[PDB]
Structure 1
Amino acid sequence: AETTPWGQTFVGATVLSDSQAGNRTICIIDSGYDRSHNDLNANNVTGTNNSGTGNWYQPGNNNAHGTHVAGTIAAIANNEGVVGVMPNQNANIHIVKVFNEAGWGYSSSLVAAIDTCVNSGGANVVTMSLGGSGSTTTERNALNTHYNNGVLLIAAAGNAGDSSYSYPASYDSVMSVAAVDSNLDHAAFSQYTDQVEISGPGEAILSTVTVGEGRLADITIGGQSYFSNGVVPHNRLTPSGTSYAPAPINASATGALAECTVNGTSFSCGNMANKICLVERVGNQGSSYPEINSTKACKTAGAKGIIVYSNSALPGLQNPFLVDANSDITVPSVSVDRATGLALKAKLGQSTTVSNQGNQDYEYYNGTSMATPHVSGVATLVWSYHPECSASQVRAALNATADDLSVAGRDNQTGYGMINAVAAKAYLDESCTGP
């Protein structure tokens, strides 16, 4: 079975066709591309090796970022895994690997990586799900030159949760991308600046990862699965020295579905022994990490499995950090959006199986680095319908047709709003400058 992650549907890429994407080339400057992956192997992908990062087609261990980004752009349509913005093996993809597991390992600069994308890869679009705090005139000038020469530059705004400028996103020649969740709410971690230009799906984004390094979750009732609704395995963290480290619980639990009613700030769980405990999330991640509250309420009651669903404040699908100070959550627990949680209410009392599985080939990630490929993927897709238009013209089309989010007009949190592939295409259909 193949799943279409919510982000793919929201940007409106599933309704268009990438049949002409062969006239475009998108270059991914990131941590490499796992070409051995079934959902990425058969893409029209090439790359340019660098002495400091080995093979572009071999990310290495625990260096799956670029593969996740690539999957959002072009995971192959094939009845397995997922699908990217351009899933039909048409778009040309060029890979420049600047990151090793240890960090930046490129023998040269970001400018050099972009040069490679353009000169070696023939890139029309350069997507950069990366950022640094520093800025320079030489870099600003080099990127402006590429942009004026017709290369569309897109990058992540950053996940520091403040107003700091991340570069290259914050240069005028680059589109700074913000992250929003499935309810179109601004992601708490998404940096807000006057450079933020457009938004893309960035919370709980399912995509391809280096084979065997992923993790998935599932909820089954009556022989049917809620996987396609979006089931996130709790990103559990437990104490490790002076900080916290990952401590995922990968197992399955089966039992009658029972809900722990939330009254104010108290929980009415009752006896959850031998039961799958459904509970509404109390609070939300931001200044703190409250996931443990609703989760532990269930555990303390004796729950075998736990399902936390979004509250009205942030009804979208959340993939929060489950900070477990006392390592109390030793059972499988997952997170689902509000709609799914309410639907599960009708199934109370029925046998339910909740499961978290490791060693997978896909995984949910959060980040402006996840929103970025949605934007660059769509930019490439839309541009393929009108390759005669310039990068600046396509950029304008995306901004002019984005769906306004948050406060009316452009804002620092979401820019012009959610990218809209269909509307952007219709815009260029009139002319390279719109109607």
Structure 2
Amino acid sequence: AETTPWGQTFVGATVLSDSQAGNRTICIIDSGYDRSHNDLNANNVTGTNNSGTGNWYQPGNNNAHGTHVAGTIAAIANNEGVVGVMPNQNANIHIVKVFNEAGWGYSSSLVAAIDTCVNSGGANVVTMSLGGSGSTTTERNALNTHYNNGVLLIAAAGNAGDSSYSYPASYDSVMSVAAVDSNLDHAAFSQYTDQVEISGPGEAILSTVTVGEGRLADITIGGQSYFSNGVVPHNRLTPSGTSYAPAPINASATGALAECTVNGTSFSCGNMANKICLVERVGNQGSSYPEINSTKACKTAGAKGIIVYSNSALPGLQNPFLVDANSDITVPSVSVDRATGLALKAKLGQSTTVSNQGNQDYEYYNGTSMATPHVSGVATLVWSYHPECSASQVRAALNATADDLSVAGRDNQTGYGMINAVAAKAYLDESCTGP
């Protein structure tokens, strides 16, 4: 079975065809590409090794970021796993690995990595789900040169949750990408600046990760699965000395579905013993991490399994941190969007199985770094229909056809809005400058 993550559908990539993507080349500057992965092995992917990061096709351990990014761009269509923006093995992908498990390990600069993308990879699009706080004239000039030479540069705005500029995203020659969730709401962590240019799916993004390093969840009732609806295993964290460390609960639980009603700020769970506890999320991640509140409400009641669904404030699919100070949540708990939670209440009383599974080959990630590949992936796809147009023209098309979000007009949170592949393509169909 193959799933189409919400982001793929929202950007409109599923209705277009990448049959011509072979005339485009997108270079991913990141932590490598797990070429051994079933959903990535057979892509038209190449790479340029660097003395400091080993093989581009071997991310190593706990260095799956680049693989997740690559999966969003080109996870292969094959009835298993997921699908990326261009899943039919047409697009040319070049990999430049600048990150090792320990961190940046490239023998040279970011400018050098981009040079390699262009000179060695023949890249038309360079996607960078990375960022730093510093900026320089040499770098600004080098990237402006590549841009004017016809290379489209795209980067992540950052997840610091403030107005700071992250580079290269904040240079004028680069598209700064913001993150929004499945309800098109601005991601609380997404940095907001006057450089933010466009938005892409960046909360609860399912994609490929280094084989065996992922994690998934599922909800089954009447022999049917809610997996395709989006079920996120709780990113549980428990105390570990001077901080918190991941303490995932990977197990399965089965029992009659029962909901803990939320009245004001109080819970009416009753006796959840031997049952799967459905509960609406109280509060939302931002200045704090309240996931534990609704979650513990269920647990305290004796629930064997817990299903937390989004509230009306943030109805989209959330993948929040489950900060468990007392390490109380020792049962499998998951997160689903509001629509899914409301559909589940119709099944109350029925036998339900909730499960969190470790050692998987896919996983849900959050980040402007996840929104970025949606944008660069769509940019490459749309560009393949009109390779004659310049990078600046393609960039203009994406901006001119993005779906305005939040307050009317361009804003620092979402830029011009949610990228729209179909509209962008239609734009260039008229001419390289649109209608």
TM-score when normalising by structure 2: 1.00
2:43 pairs with 1:43: yes
Corresponding residue number in structure 2 for 1:307: 307
SS of 2:54 mapped into structure 1:
coil
Corresponding residue number in structure 2 for 1:425: 425
**Aligned equivalents of 2:238 and 2:14: distance in 1?**
39
Cα shift at 1:167: 0.1
**Aligned equivalents of 1:310 and 1:163: distance in 2?**
27
SS of 1:14 mapped into structure 2:
helix
Equivalent residue runs for 1:34-183 within 5 Å: 34-183=34-183
1:289-343 CA-to-partner distances (Å, cap 9, x unmatched) read 0000000000000000000000000000000000000000000000000000000
Cα shift at 1:229: 0.1
Cα shift at 1:151: 0.0
**Aligned equivalents of 1:397 and 1:216: distance in 2?**
36
Aligned residue pairs, count: 435
**Aligned equivalents of 1:94 and 1:29: distance in 2?**
9
Cα shift at 1:225: 0.1
1:375-413 CA-to-partner distances (Å, cap 9, x unmatched) read 000000000000000000000000000000000000000
Cα shift at 1:97: 0.0
**Aligned equivalents of 1:345 and 1:292: distance in 2?**
21
**Aligned equivalents of 2:271 and 2:419: distance in 1?**
46
**Aligned equivalents of 2:369 and 2:74: distance in 1?**
15
**Aligned equivalents of 2:17 and 2:74: distance in 1?**
13
**Aligned equivalents of 2:291 and 2:401: distance in 1?**
36
**Aligned equivalents of 1:289 and 1:377: distance in 2?**
32
**Aligned equivalents of 1:387 and 1:180: distance in 2?**
29
**Aligned equivalents of 1:258 and 1:126: distance in 2?**
49
Which segments of structure 1 move beyond 6 Å, counting only runs of 4 or more? none
**Aligned equivalents of 1:255 and 1:343: distance in 2?**
18
2:232 pairs with 1:229: no
SS of 1:319 mapped into structure 2:
coil
Q: Which 5+ residue runs of structure 2 have no aligned equivalent?
A: none
SS of 1:29 mapped into structure 2:
strand
**Aligned equivalents of 1:158 and 1:42: distance in 2?**
31
Cα shift at 1:105: 0.0
1:66-101 CA-to-partner distances (Å, cap 9, x unmatched) read 000000000000000000000000000000000000
SS of 2:15 mapped into structure 1:
coil
Cα shift at 1:129: 0.1
Cα shift at 1:265: 0.3
**Aligned equivalents of 1:261 and 1:185: distance in 2?**
25
**Aligned equivalents of 1:413 and 1:265: distance in 2?**
30
Cα shift at 1:149: 0.1
**Aligned equivalents of 2:177 and 2:27: distance in 1?**
17
**Aligned equivalents of 1:55 and 1:34: distance in 2?**
10
Cα shift at 1:201: 0.0
SS of 2:417 mapped into structure 1:
coil
**Aligned equivalents of 1:170 and 1:388: distance in 2?**
27
Cα shift at 1:112: 0.1
**Aligned equivalents of 2:60 and 2:362: distance in 1?**
16
Cα shift at 1:124: 0.0
1:155-207 CA-to-partner distances (Å, cap 9, x unmatched) read 00000000000000000000000000000000000000000000000000000
Cα shift at 1:364: 0.0
Cα shift at 1:429: 0.1
Cα shift at 1:212: 0.0
TM-score when normalising by structure 1: 1.00
SS of 2:283 mapped into structure 1:
coil
Cα shift at 1:372: 0.0
Cα shift at 1:142: 0.1
Over the residues paired in the alignment, what is the CA RMSD in angstroms?
0.1
Cα shift at 1:215: 0.1
Cα shift at 1:38: 0.1
Corresponding residue number in structure 2 for 1:264: 264
**Aligned equivalents of 2:427 and 2:355: distance in 1?**
45
SS of 2:206 mapped into structure 1:
strand
Cα shift at 1:420: 0.1
Q: Which 5+ residue runs of structure 1 have no aligned equivalent?
A: none
Corresponding residue number in structure 1 for 2:217: 217
**Aligned equivalents of 1:95 and 1:329: distance in 2?**
40
**Aligned equivalents of 1:381 and 1:266: distance in 2?**
49
1:8-41 CA-to-partner distances (Å, cap 9, x unmatched) read 0000000000000000000000000000000000
Cα shift at 1:216: 0.0
**Aligned equivalents of 1:88 and 1:6: distance in 2?**
18
Cα shift at 1:255: 0.1
**Aligned equivalents of 2:359 and 2:245: distance in 1?**
18
**Aligned equivalents of 2:297 and 2:245: distance in 1?**
22
**Aligned equivalents of 1:39 and 1:242: distance in 2?**
39
Cα shift at 1:258: 0.1
1:120-155 CA-to-partner distances (Å, cap 9, x unmatched) read 000000000000000000000000000000000000
1:269-302 CA-to-partner distances (Å, cap 9, x unmatched) read 0000000000000000000000000000000000
SS of 1:59 mapped into structure 2:
coil
Cα shift at 1:345: 0.5
**Aligned equivalents of 1:282 and 1:387: distance in 2?**
49
Cα shift at 1:2: 0.1
**Aligned equivalents of 2:28 and 2:266: distance in 1?**
48
**Aligned equivalents of 1:287 and 1:359: distance in 2?**
31
Cα shift at 1:63: 0.1
**Aligned equivalents of 2:342 and 2:434: distance in 1?**
42
Instruction: Among all aligned residue pairs of Structure 1 and Structure 2, give the percentage whose two residues are the same amino acid.
Output: 100
SS of 2:374 mapped into structure 1:
helix
SS of 1:112 mapped into structure 2:
helix
